[PDB]
Each structure stands twice: as C-alpha cells, then as structure tokens.
C-alpha cells in the first residue's frame, strides 16, 4: 500500500478516519497482512519476542536504578520494620508548597512509597548496599542491548531461521525443560547457597570473594563422598537474628518446614533444597524426546497410540499433533491458560507461605501484590479462551481431526453449554437467595433466623494438614495417624507449629461467612466460562448463522433480519466475558481484603458476623474503610493520600464514560457528525482549513472495544486507590 | 550535577518528546507514498 496501513490495501484505500484507527489495531495480526508467507510470519514473530524481552529487562533495570539513586534501601536494611520503602522521587511543576511538604514527610524530598515488595525480595536474595543495586541495573541495560542486536541479526538474510527449525518440537521442549527451567534452578540454588544464606548469617560474599569463601565449612567433600547429610546439620537456631551471626547455623540444605521465627518467612535453606530438587526433576524430564541422537520419544506416535479400547473417546488423540504444530493460536491458548493458573497460584501461595522477610508485616504491599496477580490471571485466562476460538474459526481442519477427541467436543456442544448453564443458574439462585434471606431477617431484627452453613469440607482439609481448632481428629491432626508418625521426625514439627499459630496466614480460620463467598466465586467462574466456551464452540456456526466461519472471528453483525443478529460474532463473547471476569475477580479481591483488614485490625469478628448479608459488605467494608481515602484532600487541607484520592475519582469518570460507548450506538453519532461537517464547510475563515481524511463515526466493533477499555481502566484504577489508601491510611 | 537532571529531563520527556512524536505520526499517516 501507499498509505498508513502498508499491510492492508483495503484500509489504505479508505477515504475516512477509519484507515488510521484500524491500521493501529490490526498492526500485530501479522497472519492477516497482505502477502504474508508462513516463513516470514515465524521469523518476524521471533524477532518481536526479542524486543519484548528487552523491554522487560529495561523495566527491571529502571526499578533498581531509581531505588538506588533516589531510595532508602540501606536505611530500610538497617531498620526494616520502622522505615517506609521509597520508589522514586517526584518533580511535578504543578505542585503547591503544601504538597511538597506532605509528600516529603519522613524524608527531605517529595517521594513515592513503593508497594511492590522489591525491598523485601532484594533483602532476602542478598542485596545490602545501593552500589550493588546499581551494578545490577547496568548489567541489565547491557543485556537489553544484546537482545535488540539479536532481533536484528535473525532478521538478516543469512541468519533467518528456517520454518523447519521453528517446528522442531522435540529439541525445543528438551532444551527448554532441561536448560531453561532445570539448569536455571540449579544456578539459583547456587546463588542462594553462595550469596543469600551467607548474608542472612552476617557474612558478605560478593564478586570480590566468592571464589575464596567456601559456602560450607566441610567443602564439596561431603557431596562427592555421598555423605550429603552433613549439609543439613546445624540449622539456624530459633533465636537467630536475621542479617546477623547471633544464633546462626552452618546448614545449607534442609527440610525444616515452617517459618523463620524472627522474619516470619520461609527458611532460606529450605528454598535452596527446594530448587535443587526441582532442578533434578526437570533436567531428567528434558531427556524424553528424540533429538538427533537416536534415543527418545516421538510425540506424534505417543498421541496417535492413545485411544481408549472401549471407544468411549472415539478415535482418541490422532490428528492433534498436526493441528497443534500448524496452529499458533492453539499454542498461545494453551500457554496463556497454564500461565493464568500459575499466576493465581502465585497469589494464593505467596500470602500463606510468605517467601520474603518482613513482607507479612507490610500490609499494604501484601494487599497490592495479591490483587495485582489475580487481575493479571483473569486477563490471561480470558485470552486463552479467546485464542482458542480464533483457532476454531481460522486453523481448525474438520477432516484431519475426524472423530478426534477435539471434534467430538464440538459434537456434544449443546450438552456442555446447557449443563454449564444449569450450574450457573443453580449457583446463582441459591447463593443470592440465601444472602437476601439473611439480609431480610437481620433487617427485621431477627438475626437468629439466618441460614448459615458451616464450611465443613474445607475445615476438614485444614484439619487433615494439622489444624486443631475444628476438633476433627483426622490425619495429621491425629497423633495416632500413620501419616503423623511418618513426618513427625522430618518436616511436621515446624509445620504443625505454623499451621496452629493464629498469627499466620497459613490456612486461615474459616466460618459460615466464607461458605457463601466461595459459592459466589464459583458462580463467577462458571458463568464467565459459559460465555467463553459458548463463543468458542459456536464460532464456526450456529442455527442463526450457519455460515459464521466465512465471516471471521470479529464482524459487526449479520443484519436486522432473521430476528436481529447483534453481538453474534465470537469476538463479542470475549467482549461480554470481560465484564464477568472483572466482576468475579472483584469479588475474590474484596473477600481477601476485608478478611485480612479485620484480622489486621484485631477484630476478626466483624467479618465473621457481617459477611453473612450484603449490607455488611457495603457498610462495614466499603463505607467504613473509605474514610481515609475520601479525606485525602478536604476544605481544610491535604495529605500524602491526595494522589490516591484524586485517582479514585478519576477512575469513576473513566468507568462511566465507557457507558456512553456501550449504550449509545453508531447511527445517532453519524448523523450528528454530518451536521458538524456542514458547519465547518460553511463557516468563513475556518473554511480555509480542511481535512484530508473524511470525518466519520466510530465503527460498531470499535465502539465496543473503546467502551470495554474505558470500563476496565476505570475499574482497576478505582480499586487500586481504595486498596492502597484504605490499608495505608489505617495501618500505616 | 546529577541532581539537576530531574528538572532538565522531565520537561523534555513530557512535553518536547510527545509533541515531536505526534507530529511525525501525523506526517506519516497523511503522506501518500
């Protein structure tokens, strides 16, 4: 093309403003660009990945640099529980003198406090001085440059990888599993043993003395001799003060279980052992596929041979090998799905099994991290289903996958969708019904008539791991259980202490109130899934539009006929599911925050009793904890929470603005724009200036996207302010 | 002194840079190669 969308003649030859809008949003769909060959596609994608990696490293470099140049890491290291971590400095020419003072509280210059947890992580991993952080930043800047060079290099004529190289699954998997994940873990345990653990005990091991400071007194003698037990002897005493030698030990690899008494975090020795074990597992697993050395498995054969003899699963997995290798969308979907689960797990396990020192005592940071990863997880999950649908519309070959496990899924689509619908209905009616019953009776002044179910099943699981409050004498909660006998001399001692300590988030106590919220979360997952799954299955066709596959993943509609076909494309399913995703994640995050807020405040009872009905959430959570935020700036002054206060209102604006695009549709606006064109052409003086791109209204799908973005941005921003200002304003 | 950098770079990054970038994009999208 000769216009902006060089990759699309259709858009390029467009006489309106759409040319600009669409060109920007269709830029990264390399597969649909004019004149795209598969080889070029893969090559360009590979190079683009190098660029993304570089951006990630530049981002990390910046955090280190700004903390080192404008932060208080060293002071924090000295007094971790009495210093507020600094992120970066503030230079806003719009600030008033008062603001300069407010944001400069506790320091000598206006500054922003970090709620990212970097200080704790770096403290745990070994960083003790600002100069060290600087070196890291410089190194990452260099690595970023190297990655950029690689992107250019592999796009050059003699270094462009072949399409075959891009499809050698065995070699990549072997290498990625054994080297990227396995050896990297081994390297990490090396760092922990050589640098981190020594630092925790007061010894400095850096690039200056690492080659002459043995990690363990015995040496590598025990390792090669086979007497590995030596490395687990003399674990740090329970009276050990972190970052000092008082009460220190010599152990480097142990399975103590539990948390360091003073830092209330997992033992470093245990983490080292953890990564060492994981390393061996992955390195071994990376020797499973054939890679030009004779031995190994061929993935195609494995998939083809797996067909249940009964025939209940049809022809089995035959045909899937080719489908996956020849479809980038399916690959992306599988990846996003797994990463989404991982992100949720990080959030869930990181607040219970605190990994970093003094992180549990920083309430605001702990709250931010959870909400951060949970939201990212939602986006990652939705994307997986989205690309799954794109696959069906674009890359699915009905003939190749004949009676395959995948095809049969599309044969009982109605069954799946219908049953998922029933589940959603059941959960919805009863969950809401029970909440309303509890609200009404309480309102009428009769709280004794509430329907409160104890979460017995969950309580049982907690007891099974050792919790004793519930009084369920089972498994690890039983002294006579075979399980207890097994680990009583291994890891249970430490675990049974933490699990039965009320001041830890390991298996928090649950009650009737938790039962209901969990069932609400269930509703969210099921309903969000219904929308996404339906979109995927009904993406290649439906009774209303039996030829949907010929129109694509995203199209405005199919006309006002046959009853009306608005929002009938698969893209619209993503659009609709996004709202539900936000709602469910919101419920999850609200639950975590309120529960923890009450615990931190010392009144766990408030949640226990007020969480049973809806008014409690509104009055004892949203209304009560909004007081610090809404008073960031008042008719009498301002404080450091002013920025957070302003953002809260800003979020509401964006959210509501989104509604305009969602409820108002194109026809109205197009007609109005026409009148404006008339005016400009008929008004003297302004007539001198004219447009080169005809002014037109936004398209149907465009408006949907714009609206969803406005809704989403406002949603996240408003909650971000609340979770931070409320927690910090009250406990910090 | 490095301390003066915040007051010398921020004006440029938030005002001069964005302007020139937007101008270039306009010229790029309004040109008919």
């Amino acid at each position: 093309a000769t216009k902006f969308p060089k990759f699309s003649q259709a858009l390029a030859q467009d006489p309106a403003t759409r040319r600009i809008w669409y060109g920007i949003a269709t830029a990264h769909d390399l597969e649909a660009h004019d004149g795209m060959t598969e080889e070029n596609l893969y090559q360009k994608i590979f190079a683009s990945h190098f660029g993304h990696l570089a951006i990630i490293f530049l981002w990390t470099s910046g955090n280190l640099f700004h903390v080192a140049w404008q932060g208080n890491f060293e002071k924090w290291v000295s007094n971790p529980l009495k210093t507020r971590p600094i992120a970066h400095s503030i230079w806003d020419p719009h600030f008033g003198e008062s603001a300069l003072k407010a944001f400069s509280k506790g320091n000598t210059y206006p500054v922003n406090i970090t709620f990212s947890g970097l200080y704790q992580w770096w403290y745990t991993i070994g960083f003790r001085t600002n100069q060290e952080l600087y070196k890291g930043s410089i190194g990452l800047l260099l690595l970023a440059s190297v990655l950029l060079i690689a992107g250019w290099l592999h796009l050059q004529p003699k270094f462009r990888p072949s399409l075959s190289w891009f499809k050698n699954n065995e070699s990549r998997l072997n290498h990625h599993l054994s080297g990227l994940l396995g050896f990297s873990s081994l390297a990490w345990t090396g760092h922990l043993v050589h640098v981190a653990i020594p630092a925790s005990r007061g010894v400095h091991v850096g690039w200056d003395n690492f080659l002459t400071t043995p990690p363990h007194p015995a040496g590598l003698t025990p390792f090669f001799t086979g007497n590995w037990t030596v490395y687990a002897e003399n674990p740090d005493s329970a009276t050990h003060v972190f970052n000092t030698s008082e009460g220190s030990g010599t152990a480097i690899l142990t399975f103590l279980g539990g948390f360091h008494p003073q830092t209330q975090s997992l033992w470093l020795s245990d983490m080292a052992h953890h990564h060492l074990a994981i390393a061996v597992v992955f390195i071994v697993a990376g020797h499973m596929y054939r890679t030009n050395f004779g031995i190994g498995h061929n993935m195609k054969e494995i998939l083809d041979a797996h067909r249940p003899p009964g025939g209940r699963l049809g022809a089995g997995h035959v045909g899937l090998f080719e489908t996956i290798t020849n479809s980038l969308h399916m690959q992306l979907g599988l990846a996003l799905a797994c990463l989404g689960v991982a992100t949720s797990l990080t959030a869930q396990h990181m607040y219970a099994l605190t990994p970093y020192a003094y992180l549990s005592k920083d309430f605001t940071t702990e709250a931010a991290l959870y909400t951060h990863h949970q939201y990212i997880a939602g986006f990652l999950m939705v994307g997986a289903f989205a690309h799954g649908a794109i696959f069906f519309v674009r890359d699915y070959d009905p003939e190749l996958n004949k009676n395959n496990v995948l095809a049969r899924m599309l044969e009982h689509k109605e069954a799946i969708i219908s049953h998922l619908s029933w589940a959603s209905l059941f959960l919805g009616f009863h969950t809401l019904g029970l909440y309303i019953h509890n609200d009404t009776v309480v309102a009428f002044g009769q709280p004794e008539k509430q329907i409160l179910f104890e979460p017995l099943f969950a309580e049982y699981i907690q007891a099974a791991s050792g919790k004793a409050v519930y009084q369920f004498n089972v498994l690890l909660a039983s002294s006579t259980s075979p399980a207890t006998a097994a680990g009583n001399q291994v890891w249970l001692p430490g675990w049974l202490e933490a699990i039965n300590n009320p001041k830890t988030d390991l298996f928090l106590k649950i009650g009737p109130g938790d039962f209901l919220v969990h069932h609400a979360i269930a509703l969210g997952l099921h309903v969000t899934a219904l929308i996404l799954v339906k979109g995927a299955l009904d993406a290649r066709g439906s009774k209303l539009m039996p030829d949907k596959k010929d129109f694509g993943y995203s199209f405005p509609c199919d006309g006002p006929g046959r009853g009306g076909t608005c929002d009938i494309s698969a893209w619209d399913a993503f659009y609709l599911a996004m709202f539900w995703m936000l709602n469910t994640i919101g419920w999850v995050t609200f639950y975590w925050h309120w529960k923890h807020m009450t615990i931190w405040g010392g009144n766990p009872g408030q949640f226990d009793e007020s969480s049973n009905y809806i008014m409690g959430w509104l009055r004892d959570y949203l209304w009560l904890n909004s007081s610090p935020l809404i008073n960031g700036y008042n008719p009498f002054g301002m404080n450091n929470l002013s920025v957070w206060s302003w953002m809260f209102l800003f979020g509401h604006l964006i959210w509501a603005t989104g509604f305009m695009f969602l409820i108002s549709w194109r026809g109205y606006w197009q007609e109005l724009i026409e009148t404006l064109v008339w005016a400009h052409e008929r008004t003297p003086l302004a007539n001198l200036i004219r447009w080169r791109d005809k002014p037109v209204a936004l398209s149907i799908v465009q408006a949907r996207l714009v609206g969803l973005v406005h809704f989403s941005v406002g949603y996240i921003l408003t909650y971000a302010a609340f979770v931070i200002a409320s927690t910090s304003g009250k406990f910090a | 002194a490095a301390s003066f950098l915040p007051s010398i770079l921020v004006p440029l990054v938030g005002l001069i840079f964005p302007a020139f970038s937007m101008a270039l994009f306009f010229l790029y999208v309004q040109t008919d190669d």
């Binding site: 190079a47 660029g51 140049w69 950029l148 250019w152 | 490095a2």
Partner: peptide, 29 residues
C-alpha cells in the same frame, strides 16, 4: 551513593539501547 559519573555512565548505556532499538523497529517494518 551513586556518583554523578555513575549516573552519566548509565545514561550513555541507555542511549546505545535506544539507537539499537530504532534499528530493530525499522528492520521489523
């Protein structure tokens, strides 16, 4: 304390990244 020289060195490194970034972008174009 990060010295001025250290800060200036960092800035020089960033510049290299920038010039190498423009090229990658223009090569992908």
């Amino acid at each position: 304390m990060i010295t001025d020289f250290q800060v200036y060195i960092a800035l020089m490194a960033a510049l290299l990244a920038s010039v190498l970034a423009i090229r990658l972008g223009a090569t992908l174009y």
